[PDB]
Amino acid sequence: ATFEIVNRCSYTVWAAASKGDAALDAGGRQLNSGESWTINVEPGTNGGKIWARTDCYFDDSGSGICKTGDCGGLLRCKRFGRPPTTLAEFSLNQYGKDYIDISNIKGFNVPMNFSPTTRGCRGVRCAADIVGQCPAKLKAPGGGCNDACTVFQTSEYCCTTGKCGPTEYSRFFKRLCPDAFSYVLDKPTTVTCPGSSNYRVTFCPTA
């Protein structure tokens, strides 16, 4: 599958692509404002994630730091990024279907459109100003809006027992982005695509 990753933000992001135990394609790259990065994701990729990182410093070997979505200080992510991270999530060729979603379960740093570039299902979008509106106790100092599970580390927010409900914090994310996961047991906003669909992830799709 091809993912085109486009930075429509006015600021530089460092795209990341990981399935949690491995990079997808190169796993990470600097995107200046307007730059496009095409990756190939293996068919059958289960639990793929794409995210943006903000305010990165990388030295010559690709080691450094980001204020949001840092993945063990690497330019080329092998692991998931540190919250807050708006997540493009995908499982490809799962019994002849692709499953895509956006999640705020790991919070929100960068607005995001996640759309197929092939036919047969709709894209999803979380492009509201969640950082600007972010409740005071979820505000990440480095930028972005933490989920309540990252901040408070409770069973209710992290859904540790596999039982929990929506919360004041989950409902803030859900109110601003109905089409994204707000908490672990949120009514699914998963979109079903045809197997071997191609995708565009756009950072700042409206800004």
Swiss-Prot record:
Q: Where are the transmembrane segments?
A: none
State the family named in the UniProt similarity comment for this chain.
Answer: Belongs to the thaumatin family.
Q: Which GO terms describe its cellular component?
A: cytoplasmic vesicle
- Where's it mainly located? cytoplasm
The entry's keywords: Cytoplasmic vesicle, Disulfide bond, Signal, Taste-modifying protein
Protein's job: Taste-modifying protein; intensely sweet-tasting. It is 100000 times sweeter than sucrose on a molar basis.
Tell me which species this is from. Thaumatococcus daniellii (Katemfe)
What is the recorded name of this protein?
Thaumatin I
Q: Which cysteines are disulphide-bonded?
A: C9-C204, C56-C66, C71-C77, C121-C193, C126-C177, C134-C145, C149-C158, C159-C164
Mind telling me which Gene3D superfamilies this protein's record contains?
Thaumatin
The record's annotation in PROSITE patterns points to: THAUMATIN_1 (PS00316), THAUMATIN_2 (PS51367)
